[PDB]
Short mmCIF file of C-alpha atoms in Angstrom, two decimals:
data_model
loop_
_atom_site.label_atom_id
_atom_site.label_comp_id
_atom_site.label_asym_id
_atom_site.label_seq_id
_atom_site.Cartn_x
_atom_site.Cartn_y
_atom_site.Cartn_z
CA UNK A 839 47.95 18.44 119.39
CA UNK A 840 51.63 18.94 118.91
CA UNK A 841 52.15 17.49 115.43
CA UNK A 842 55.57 18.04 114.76
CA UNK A 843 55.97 17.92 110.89
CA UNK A 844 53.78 20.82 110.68
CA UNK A 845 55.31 23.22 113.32
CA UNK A 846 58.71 23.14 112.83
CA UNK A 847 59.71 26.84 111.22
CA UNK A 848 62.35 27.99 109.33
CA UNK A 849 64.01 31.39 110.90
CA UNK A 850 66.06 33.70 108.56
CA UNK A 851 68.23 36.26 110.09
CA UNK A 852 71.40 37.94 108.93
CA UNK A 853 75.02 37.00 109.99
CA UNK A 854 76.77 39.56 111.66
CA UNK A 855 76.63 43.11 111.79
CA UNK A 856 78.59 45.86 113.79
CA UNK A 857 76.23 48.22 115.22
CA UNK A 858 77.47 51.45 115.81
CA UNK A 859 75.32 53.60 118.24
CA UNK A 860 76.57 56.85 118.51
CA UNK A 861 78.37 58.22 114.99
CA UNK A 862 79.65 61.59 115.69
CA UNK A 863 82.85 59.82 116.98
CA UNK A 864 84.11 59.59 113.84
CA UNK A 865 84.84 62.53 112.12
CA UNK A 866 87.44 65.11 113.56
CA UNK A 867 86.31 68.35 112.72
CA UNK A 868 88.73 71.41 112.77
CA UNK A 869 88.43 75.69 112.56
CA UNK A 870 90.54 78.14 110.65
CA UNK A 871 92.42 80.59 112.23
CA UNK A 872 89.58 83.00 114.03
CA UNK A 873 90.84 86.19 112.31
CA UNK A 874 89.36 84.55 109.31
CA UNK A 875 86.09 83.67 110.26
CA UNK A 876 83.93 84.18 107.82
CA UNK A 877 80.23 85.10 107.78
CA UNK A 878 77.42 84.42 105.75
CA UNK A 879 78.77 86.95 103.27
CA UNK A 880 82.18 86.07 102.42
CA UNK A 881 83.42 88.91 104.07
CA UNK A 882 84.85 88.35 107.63
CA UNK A 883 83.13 89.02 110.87
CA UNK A 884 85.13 91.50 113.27
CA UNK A 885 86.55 93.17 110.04
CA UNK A 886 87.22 96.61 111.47
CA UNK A 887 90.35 97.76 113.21
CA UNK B 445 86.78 115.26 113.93
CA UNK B 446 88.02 118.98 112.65
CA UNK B 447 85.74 118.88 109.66
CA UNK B 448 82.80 116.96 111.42
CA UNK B 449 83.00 114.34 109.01
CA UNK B 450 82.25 110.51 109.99
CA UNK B 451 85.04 109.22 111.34
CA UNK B 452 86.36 105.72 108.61
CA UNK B 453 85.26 102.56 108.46
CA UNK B 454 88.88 100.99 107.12
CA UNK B 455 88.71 97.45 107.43
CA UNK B 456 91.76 95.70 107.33
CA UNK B 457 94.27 95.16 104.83
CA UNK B 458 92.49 97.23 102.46
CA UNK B 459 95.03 98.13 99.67
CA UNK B 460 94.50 102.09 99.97
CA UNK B 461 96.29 103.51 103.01
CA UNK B 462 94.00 105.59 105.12
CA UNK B 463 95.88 108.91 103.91
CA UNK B 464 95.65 108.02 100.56
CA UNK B 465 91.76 107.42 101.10
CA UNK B 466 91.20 110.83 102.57
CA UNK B 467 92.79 112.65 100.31
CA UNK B 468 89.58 111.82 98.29
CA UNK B 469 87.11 111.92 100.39
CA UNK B 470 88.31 115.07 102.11
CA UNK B 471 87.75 118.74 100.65
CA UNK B 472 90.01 121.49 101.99
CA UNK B 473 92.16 122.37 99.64
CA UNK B 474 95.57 123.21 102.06
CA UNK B 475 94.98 119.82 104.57
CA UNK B 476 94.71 117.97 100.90
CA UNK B 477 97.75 118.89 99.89
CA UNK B 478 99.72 117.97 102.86
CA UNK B 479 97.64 114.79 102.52
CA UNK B 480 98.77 114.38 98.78
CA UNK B 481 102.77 115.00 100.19
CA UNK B 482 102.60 112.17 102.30
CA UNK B 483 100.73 109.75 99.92
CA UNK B 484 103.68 110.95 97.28
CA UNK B 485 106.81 111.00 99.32
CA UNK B 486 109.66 108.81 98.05
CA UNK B 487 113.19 108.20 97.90
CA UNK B 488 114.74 108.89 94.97
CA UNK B 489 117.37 106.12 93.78
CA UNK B 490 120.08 108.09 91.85
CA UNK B 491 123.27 106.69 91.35
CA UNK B 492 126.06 109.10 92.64
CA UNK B 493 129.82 108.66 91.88
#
């Protein structure tokens, strides 16, 4: 039977969000000036003249 | 290449200029003292009338 009383439900959700899918669109990422790239050691890579 | 020696690694802007570094690591005793002429030769500021 449909009683009523007993099958009403209360449904709790949030407000609002902003979803962001992708979030690599943010940041602006530079490089130093290639003569001073540096390696894994802190000396530079293509040292040698 | 007239002494069979490796030719330098010199990297740059090291602070020792590449006759002043083979004046070490060089032994002749007449093409290291041409090499210590040029690693000493300087003006001499006198003051003149």
């Amino acid at each position: 039977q449909f009683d009523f009383r007993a099958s009403m439900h209360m449904l709790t959700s949030n407000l609002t969000f902003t979803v962001y899918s992708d979030l690599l669109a943010f940041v602006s990422a530079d490089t130093v000036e290639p003569i001073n790239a540096v390696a894994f050691d802190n000396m530079r890579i293509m040292n040698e003249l | 290449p007239a002494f069979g020696m490796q030719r330098m690694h010199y990297r740059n802007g090291d602070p020792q200029t590449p006759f002043q570094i083979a004046e070490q690591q060089i032994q002749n005793f007449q093409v290291a003292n041409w090499l210590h002429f040029v690693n000493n030769n300087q003006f001499r500021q006198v003051v003149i009338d």
